[PDB]
Design a binder for this molecule. Structure first.
Ligand SMILES: [Zn+2]
Ligand SMILES: [Zn+2]
Length: 49
């Protein structure tokens, strides 16, 4: 029993395949794998049009 999956940092969902973001450096369930999903700081930093 060691690191049995990472829980989303937005909805807190225990997933087996945590999506690691190479922009904000955070784990998020597949459902929130997208950037905007977890409100990626990078997306907010550059939001035009
Ligand atoms: Zn999630
Ligand atoms: Zn991100």
């Amino acid at each position: 029993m060691l690191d049995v999956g990472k829980h989303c940092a937005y909805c807190r969902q225990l997933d087996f395949l945590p999506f690691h973001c190479s922009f904000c450096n955070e784990d998020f369930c597949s459902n929130h794998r997208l950037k905007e999903d977890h409100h990626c700081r990078w997306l907010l930093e550059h939001e035009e049009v």
